[PDB]
Amino acid sequence: ETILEQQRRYHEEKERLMDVMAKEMLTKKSTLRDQINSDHRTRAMQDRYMEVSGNLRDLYDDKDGLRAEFYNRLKQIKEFHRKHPNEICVPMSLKARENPSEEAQNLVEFTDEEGYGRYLDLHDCINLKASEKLDYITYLSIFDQLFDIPKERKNAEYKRYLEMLLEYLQDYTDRVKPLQDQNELFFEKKWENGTFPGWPKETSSALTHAGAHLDLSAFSSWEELASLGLDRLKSALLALGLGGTLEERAQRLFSTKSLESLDTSLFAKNPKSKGTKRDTERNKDIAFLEAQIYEYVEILGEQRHLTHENVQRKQARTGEEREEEEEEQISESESEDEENIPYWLYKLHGLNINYNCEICGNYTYRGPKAFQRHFAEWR
């Protein structure tokens, strides 16, 4: 096998994919814009387009129609980028043959399926135009990733966690809204004004589950951003700063041992002590998870607010209102991502009498004259 051909086909496929996700970014600029905006608040350096472009949903001169579909295409582009990364990887890793090419000369076959099957394998849009999804990701379904209450990233469902929370506090004095008020705590509040004692079991377990949820939700709602990049960023921030990152002019330096320290000196000589060794060796995973909950909730401030709002709304609804709203959320959830008298007369005449034809759909006929007319019919 001549490697030249393989590497060629690779560069060609990469080109094909770039072209596909570029066509996408073209039809609906939001796809990129959306993504980029979020990226902006994670990696501050990122340069973002002119606001006007974003609003008018245009890339150069033409303003495109505003578009579940955005998210869909974002996950599709996600798998595309996965393919691309794979190919890039493998890639990083004459007369003799022309003679054997003479093999099996006599085949009556038309061969127009190398670039067409690929170009096609990665393009928009069924028979003609029913499903935006490419053949590449034809079995891609968002509803298996997002619940109905999340509305493809619009809201995050925290009712469940309100339940678990009630189970954690061993009472009922806590309302959904007071619970959200609790969540708001999450750079210093969640640490110095904790809902519960941060060494409580139930509490730490809960916090773990919740943290995990928020993170998965985050990356779920923003497929286009490099997950590994974000993860590593946060981890390095955790290791390099979260080193007495919390400082008070009065109490000094706080340690996630839950104690302060006069000066940095005693703080450092405390990070080798048996106490801190014990704690950092037992409560490491929890501390880290807490931190993640913190930063991921920060990155999702807009979604948190959006949901809290939703809660208050639904709460202030009536019965009919709440019902119709639910109807709406439901429809949004299960909708295609791309839209396209003679009484004795009938006895006398013999009609309205129950009868059945077996060969036709086990069909029912109400009259004998009619069924006798079935014998000559189209169906």
């Binding site: 619940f147 109905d148 209450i149 999340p150 469902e157 009712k159 469940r160 966690y161 309100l162 339940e163 678990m164 929370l165 009630l166 189970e167 079991k201 139930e202 730490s204 377990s205 916090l207 773990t208 589950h209 060796e281 037992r282 409560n283 490491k284 995973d285 929890i286």
Partner: protein, 86 residues
């Protein structure tokens, strides 16, 4: 009187303990006379029920999915988390 003691927890995420000592966590959607249970998005745990075990929370976890458990083999249930909205 009320019959509610099971119906209350319906739709909630529930931690169920089996007679061999397994832990089934799923969404409690239905029960009956025998306490045969219907558990949506159900996983099985063996080693632990985590209360934030600093080493790890999850070992021998298995994704099962939609589970019908026979009541014969059920021991007990506690509330694990609130209902998923979906």
């Amino acid at each position: 009187g009320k019959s509610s003691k099971m119906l209350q927890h319906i739709d909630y995420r529930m931690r169920c303990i089996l007679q061999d000592g397994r832990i089934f966590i799923g969404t409690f959607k239905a029960f009956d006379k025998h306490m045969n249970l219907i558990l949506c998005d159900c996983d099985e745990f063996r080693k632990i029920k985590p209360k934030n075990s600093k080493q790890a929370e999850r070992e021998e976890k298995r994704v099962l999915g939609l589970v019908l458990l026979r009541g014969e083999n059920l021991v007990s249930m506690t509330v694990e988390g609130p209902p998923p909205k979906d």
